[PDB]
Amino acid sequence: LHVDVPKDVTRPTITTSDEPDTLYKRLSILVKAHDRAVLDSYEYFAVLAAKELGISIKVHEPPRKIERFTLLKSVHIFKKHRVQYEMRTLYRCLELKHLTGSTASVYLEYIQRNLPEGVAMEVTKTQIQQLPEHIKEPMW
Amino acid sequence: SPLSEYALRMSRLSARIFGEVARSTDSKSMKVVSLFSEQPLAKKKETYDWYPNHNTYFALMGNLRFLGLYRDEHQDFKDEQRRLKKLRGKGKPRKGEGKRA
Amino acid sequence: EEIVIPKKKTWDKVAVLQALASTVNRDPTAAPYVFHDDPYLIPTSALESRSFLLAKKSGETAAKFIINSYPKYFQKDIAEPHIPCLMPEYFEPQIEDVSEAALEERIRLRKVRASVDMFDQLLQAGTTVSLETTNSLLDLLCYYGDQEPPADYP
Amino acid sequence: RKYLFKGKRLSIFADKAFADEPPEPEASPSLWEIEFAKQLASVADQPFENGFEEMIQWTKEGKLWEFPVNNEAGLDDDGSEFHEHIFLDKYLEDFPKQGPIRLFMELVTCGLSKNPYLSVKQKVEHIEWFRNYFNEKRDILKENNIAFT
Amino acid sequence: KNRAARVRVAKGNKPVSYEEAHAPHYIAHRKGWLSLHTGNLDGEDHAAERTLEDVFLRKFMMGTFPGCLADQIVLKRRANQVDICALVLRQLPAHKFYFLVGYSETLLSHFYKCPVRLHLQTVPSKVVYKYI
Amino acid sequence: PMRRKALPPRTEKMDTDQDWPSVYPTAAPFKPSAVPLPVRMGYPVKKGVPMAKEGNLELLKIPNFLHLTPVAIKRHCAALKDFCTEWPAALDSDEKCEEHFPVEIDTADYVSSGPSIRNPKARAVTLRVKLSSLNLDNHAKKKLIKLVGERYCKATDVLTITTDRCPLKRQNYDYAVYLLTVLYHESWKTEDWENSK
Amino acid sequence: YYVDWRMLRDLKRRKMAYEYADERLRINSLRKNTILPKDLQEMAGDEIAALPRDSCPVRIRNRCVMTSRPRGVKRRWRLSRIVFRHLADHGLLSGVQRAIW
Ligand SMILES: [Mg+2]
Numbered sequence: 001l002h003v004d005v006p007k008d009v010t011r012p013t014i015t016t017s018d019e020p021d022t023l024y025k026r027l028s029i030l031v032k033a034h035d036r037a038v039l040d041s042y043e044y045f046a047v048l049a050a051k052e053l054g055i056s057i058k059v060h061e062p063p064r065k066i067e068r069f070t071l072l073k074s075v076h077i078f079k080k081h082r083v084q085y086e087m088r089t090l091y092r093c094l095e096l097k098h099l100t101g102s103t104a105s106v107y108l109e110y111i112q113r114n115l116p117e118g119v120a121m122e123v124t125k126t127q128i129q130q131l132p133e134h135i136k137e138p139m140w
Numbered sequence: 141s142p143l144s145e146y147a148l149r150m151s152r153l154s155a156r157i158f159g160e161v162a163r164s165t166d167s168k169s170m171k172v173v174s175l176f177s178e179q180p181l182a183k184k185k186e187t188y189d190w191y192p193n194h195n196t197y198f199a200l201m202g203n204l205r206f207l208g209l210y211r212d213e214h215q216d217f218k219d220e221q222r223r224l225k226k227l228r229g230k231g232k233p234r235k236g237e238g239k240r241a
Numbered sequence: 242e243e244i245v246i247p248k249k250k251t252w253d254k255v256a257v258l259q260a261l262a263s264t265v266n267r268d269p270t271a272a273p274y275v276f277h278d279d280p281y282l283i284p285t286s287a288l289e290s291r292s293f294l295l296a297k298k299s300g301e302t303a304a305k306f307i308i309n310s311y312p313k314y315f316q317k318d319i320a321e322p323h324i325p326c327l328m329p330e331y332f333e334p335q336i337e338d339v340s341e342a343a344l345e346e347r348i349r350l351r352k353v354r355a356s357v358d359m360f361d362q363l364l365q366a367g368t369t370v371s372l373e374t375t376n377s378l379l380d381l382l383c384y385y386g387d388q389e390p391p392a393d394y395p
Numbered sequence: 396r397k398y399l400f401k402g403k404r405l406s407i408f409a410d411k412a413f414a415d416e417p418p419e420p421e422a423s424p425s426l427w428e429i430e431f432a433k434q435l436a437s438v439a440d441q442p443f444e445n446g447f448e449e450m451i452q453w454t455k456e457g458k459l460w461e462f463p464v465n466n467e468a469g470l471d472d473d474g475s476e477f478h479e480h481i482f483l484d485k486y487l488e489d490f491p492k493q494g495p496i497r498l499f500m501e502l503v504t505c506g507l508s509k510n511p512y513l514s515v516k517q518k519v520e521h522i523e524w525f526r527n528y529f530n531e532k533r534d535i536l537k538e539n540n541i542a543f544t
Numbered sequence: 545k546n547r548a549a550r551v552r553v554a555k556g557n558k559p560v561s562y563e564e565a566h567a568p569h570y571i572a573h574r575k576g577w578l579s580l581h582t583g584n585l586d587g588e589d590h591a592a593e594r595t596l597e598d599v600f601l602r603k604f605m606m607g608t609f610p611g612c613l614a615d616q617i618v619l620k621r622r623a624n625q626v627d628i629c630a631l632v633l634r635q636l637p638a639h640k641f642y643f644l645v646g647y648s649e650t651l652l653s654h655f656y657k658c659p660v661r662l663h664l665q666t667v668p669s670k671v672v673y674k675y676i
Numbered sequence: 677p678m679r680r681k682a683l684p685p686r687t688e689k690m691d692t693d694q695d696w697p698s699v700y701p702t703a704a705p706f707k708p709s710a711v712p713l714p715v716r717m718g719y720p721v722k723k724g725v726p727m728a729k730e731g732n733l734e735l736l737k738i739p740n741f742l743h744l745t746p747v748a749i750k751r752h753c754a755a756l757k758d759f760c761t762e763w764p765a766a767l768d769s770d771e772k773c774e775e776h777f778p779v780e781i782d783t784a785d786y787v788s789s790g791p792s793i794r795n796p797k798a799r800a801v802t803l804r805v806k807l808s809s810l811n812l813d814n815h816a817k818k819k820l821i822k823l824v825g826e827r828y829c830k831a832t833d834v835l836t837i838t839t840d841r842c843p844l845k846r847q848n849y850d851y852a853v854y855l856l857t858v859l860y861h862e863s864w865k866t867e868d869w870e871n872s873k
Numbered sequence: 874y875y876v877d878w879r880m881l882r883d884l885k886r887r888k889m890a891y892e893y894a895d896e897r898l899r900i901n902s903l904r905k906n907t908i909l910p911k912d913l914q915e916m917a918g919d920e921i922a923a924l925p926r927d928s929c930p931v932r933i934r935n936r937c938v939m940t941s942r943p944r945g946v947k948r949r950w951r952l953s954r955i956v957f958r959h960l961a962d963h964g965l966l967s968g969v970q971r972a973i974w
């Protein structure tokens with residue numbers, strides 16, 4: 001828009017509660033896809049998004065898995081003649097560190113809502129909390 | 141090696157805490173725990189919902205064809221083969237009036 | 242020594258989408274989002290704009306008619322969580338017995354003539370009817386002025 | 396001159412020292428109030444301006460999943476607790492306190508505690524079934540020297 | 545000789561699209577996949593249900609747009625959203641497409657209990673990759 | 677009854693200094709009439725060039741990132757900053773975290789495409805605590821290590837409690853915390869039969 | 874309409890096994906142990922036998938959902954080898970390709 005621009009855009013209401021926040025020591029995001037190029041583009045979007053919000057991120061590529069199975073090519077007899085099929089799974093692991101519970105929800109929503117078709121995520125949150133108050137003091 | 145009293149009494153204290161079988165149970169009697177801890181084969185969604193509802197698809201699409209919102213090339217092909225076959229006198233006989241009396 | 246943990250912020254389920262929406266502005270070279278984004282399907286004139294939307298509303302009503310008329314084919318629910326707004330609707334009373342409860346159902350469904358018949362039948366028997374229930378009937382009749390709610394069907 | 400908020404007023408009413416004394420839902424929403432609200436929404440009802448506004452509406456209607464994804468969204472097993480699922484020996488009080496029936500029900504209740512696919516109500520039904528089963532077989536049990544209830 | 549999904553040679557007068565020209569061994573090499581979901585990835589469930597839904601969704605669009613489909617449809621699943629991307633010939637009037645889009649979306653959203661959207665790109669005529 | 681004519685593509689009216697994020701606000705399919713780029717895709721025929729964007733099924737088959745561009749992502753995250761909360765500065769190291777927060781709770785989420793959001797693996801929970809963090813007497817630590825069996829790792833001195841028996845994640849989480857409390861309190865208790873070791 | 878009468882019989886077998894799953898579990902648990910009197914086990918051995926034969930879950934056969942083929946089926950997709958190859962060889966299965974190596 002050249003001349004016609006919003007004046008005071010409405011922004012969502014964020015209210016700070018009195019409950020303490022979760023503390024995630026680690027947060028591993030394992031994305032899976034049949035296509036390597038899609039993971040490269042998603043890895044760029046996720047690393048850029050993390051860096052813009054202040055999150056610390058690292059990336060590595062777990063070894064790919066190829067599952068192969070054999071089928072019978074003909075409809076009837078001709079046993080020795082087969083057709084083989086495979087499904088390839090490729091992985092990109094985004095290991096985040098030192099996240100509060102509010103930072104991990106907004107980030108995961110933003111990147112989960114933009115998860116391309118054919119891509120599956122496996123978030124593995126690792127929370128750190130104090131000891132139970134009963135355990136803190138031995139009681140007989 | 142054998143399990144001494146301390147070893148055996150510790151094992152029972154552990155099972156009691158972790159909700160495991162506490163007594164000495166034969167392999168045969170451990171199936172009762174397996175039967176009641178695992179979903180039976182007939183109760184799994186893969187088993188009872190193995191098939192799509194073939195009645196819902198066939199009925200729904202047939203109704204849409206009669207409403208003019210779906211076109212079944214396969215049915216139109218068969219509907220015209222029946223028309224031509226009936227003209228040739230090879231149509232379906234009426235029930236109870238077949239060639240054999 | 243004791244660490245200070247930050248106080249967790251909270252927001253509505255749609256809050257994140259609302260924030261992302263605020264960033265984007267109207268596309269000056271595109272037709273309204275309702276209209277299909279294809280050169281063949283973009284409304285050239287103002288008459289086509291209304292016609293294109295009325296044809297869309299007509300197709301939505303044709304589907305809702307089929308879903309509400311053959312509900313048995315639209316009853317399998319495979320959505321977790323369950324989506325209430327994607328289930329067939331039922332508007333006809335399913336309580337057959339003639340009781341104050343049955344009248345209340347018809348009033349809830351907003352049927353005017355059927356409710357009057359069951360109210361009169363209740364009076365014919367003489368069974369007690371609550372003043373609050375009798376008011377729910379008058380509300381329906383007074384608001385719709387004794388005429389069945391407007392609707393469109395074959 | 397024509398000041399919008401400077402000048403004489405009707406003065407029939409007085410300043411509302413008391414405000415909204417009667418609650419808004421004085422009665423359950425009537426057809427009149429339920430229908431007026433539907434019309435107020437239509438006043439500001441405009442079509443979607445982008446895919447974000449469409450997704451927001453689906454979210455408000457439950458059509459679209461909420462994010463971040465929760466695989467147990469809306470899935471509460473009657474608001475139970477872990478101790479309800481795990482400790483099930485309270486329901487075996489009717490059964491003999493010792494003997495073969497107790498030994499068997501111990502194995503039954505051990506499996507039920509390790510069952511994540513059943514609710515507490517369903518697990519109790521399995522226990523109740525055996526209670527009635529052994530009651531019917533009182534005569535066979537007595538022959539084997541087992542006394543039930 | 546292999547016959548699977550192979551449009552055979554005639555006398556150089558048979559138009560074939562890019563999708564039709566390429567035999568099965570070119571899948572993942574020269575041409576991609578028409579459906580993209582997460583059900584065939586490693587350690588994923590509900591492949592059978594995604595595959596059955598696709599078979600139906602393709603027969604539905606063929607009948608609902610008879611003679612108006614220039615190429616096979618592309619199905620894209622994101623979260624619980626379904627997206628159908630079809631190349632459609634410009635045969636029908638414009639207002640008729642708006643009817644079939646509203647109808648096909650509402651009907652398939654109340655049948656599979658998911659939000660379904662239809663994306664139509666209109667072509668002047670079928671695109672010919674090569675004459676074989 | 678003249679046939680309808682298609683309008684010229686709207687890319688023609690697009691300036692080179694436009695606000696592209698506004699053009700593709702959200703994930704959409706590739707629209708050759710809205711993407712102002714002469715992109716070509718397709719294995720070319722001999723003496724031929726790759727196919728053009730219009731009527732290109734291959735470009736439609738791609739999960740494009742047009743909505744996610746470096747300009748959009750930076751503008752998006754700028755709005756999303758208000759949501760984030762600051763990590764406590766004191767916990768600048770992993771060792772510092774173990775001192776004040778010795779208990780590590782592992783929970784897993786799964787995101788897939790389909791009508792159902794349910795995955796059986798989401799119920800499982802895993803608690804990890806180091807025995808050094810727990811206040812254990814020489815007697816208690818030996819009793820704790822014998823009861824837990826293989827859950828304890830001598831090399832790392834970490835106790836691992838994995839709970840998936842309960843249906844929900846909030847139940848499995850509360851159960852592992854319970855298992856720790858009973859094991860700790862039981863370890864301190866001394867039984868008469870223990871003197872016969 | 875289902876594909877054939879064989880698929881129809883299978884569907885009924887799958888729907889009657891789901892109804893009798895809890896019952897056949899509770900009764901069969903009384904038999905798969907060594908802790909209960911053999912007289913009770915012999916009587917439970919006949920209560921399970923008296924249940925209808927279609928409740929037995931070993932009478933279910935996995936058939937192609939689209940052609941009702943009893944053998945050649947792949948359990949992950951519930952399709953026969955012939956039907957699977959038609960969808961795979963046309964690019965219609967998401968992520969399935971030919972195996973060259
Ligand atoms: Mg036949």
Ligand SMILES: [Mg+2]
Pocket residue numbers: 931933934
């Ligand atoms: Mg068999």
